[PDB]
Subunit: 136 residues, 3 copies
């Protein structure tokens, strides 16, 4: 109820995650790289690696999104979440063309993660001072 | 039970994830791939990729599982969740044998993943529309 | 509440971010060009270590929260703190030599087992009570 926006952001992100993975499938077929190999076509390795970078940061994003969303402010976290989704959109397709074209998306994505993390830390400390240290 | 069914599926799924990760460790010994190398025996590389595929799809499953479970229907999401676990079981051992034999498990697993996402989306849309009420 | 779980989760997410970025630093020192993840054995250990931390992280998070909610938060939190340290050992251990990763790995996996156990017990317990 008080987390419906976070839920929505999470579901959209999961689609993008699902999407990226399926894109790795198409590259696999398009650049005749047969499983389980992930080397061969230079084209595939960029798509695969791009996708690999997105999965490792995904749980970080989800945790920091929700911590920020729950302990600081839901609307602001959501907005940031959406920019992260776009940053990752830029990152993924950028990488597929060339390694040089991934930087903006990546930098945008990590900047957003830093801020979510920051807000989450603040909201929790703020909440900690109420329940444990009685500064109600 | 509020989320006891969802919790239960998540613990079962996490255990399978642990199993998969540890099989790759066991695989290093049987096929003699010494760390940090991940190439050599075609057998290890299939086991490695399979587990790697399970890893990249795992957070998707959990999210869609809970969103579906929380906003649409817990029992139905839970049942779908169990099928996903089995699909991955089929996928994993299938891939281990040959890349060709992963497809039933893979298709089955992603089919549930598609379905979980939908119900979660619908249930959330349903919950959002209490902006009106 | 769940404030202790929240704090641990954020502390853990920070370490995950750290590991990921270390792989970037490794690319520079050992001159590995993207998208390649092979080359220097020095780089290859760091990459694998970070990659091993990635596959166990969601496992850790779920059992942490399941343990924290269905058994006991403080106890789960304490275990969580140990897991994070275990992973600190594993990573830096692996970077030095693959042989020196074992202590960190076994400790983190032991904690993962206990969190799993505690979580399973609380969920079984709550489910049977209906
Ligand atoms: C108390 C629960 C301990 C779980 C962690 C653990 O004991 O790790 C295994 C040990 O052998 C340390 O390597
Ligand atoms: C009681 C005190 C210690 C008992 C330790 C038993 C370990 C339980 C193992 C388990 O439940 O498996 C889960 C893990 O394998 C996942 O990493
Ligand atoms: C037969 C094999 C397993 C059935 C065990 C079901 C009961 C598990 C024990 C339990 O629920 O106790 C845990 C509580 O102490 C947590 O408060
Ligand atoms: Na996209
Ligand atoms: Na994962």
């Amino acid at each position: 109820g008080n987390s419906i926006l976070l839920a929505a952001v999470s579901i959209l992100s999961a689609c993008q995650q699902s999407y990226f993975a399926l894109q790795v499938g198409k590259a696999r077929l398009k650049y005749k790289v047969t499983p389980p190999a992930v080397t061969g076509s230079p084209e595939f390795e960029r798509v695969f690696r791009a996708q690999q970078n997105c999965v490792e940061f995904y749980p970080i994003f989800i945790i920091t999104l929700w911590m920020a969303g729950w302990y600081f402010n839901q609307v602001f976290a959501t907005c940031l979440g959406l920019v992260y989704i776009y940053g990752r959109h830029l990152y993924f397709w950028g990488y597929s063309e060339a390694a040089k074209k991934r930087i903006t998306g990546f930098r945008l994505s990590l900047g957003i993660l830093a801020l979510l993390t920051l807000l989450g830390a603040l909201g929790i400390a703020n909440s900690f001072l109420d329940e444990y240290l009685d500064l109600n």
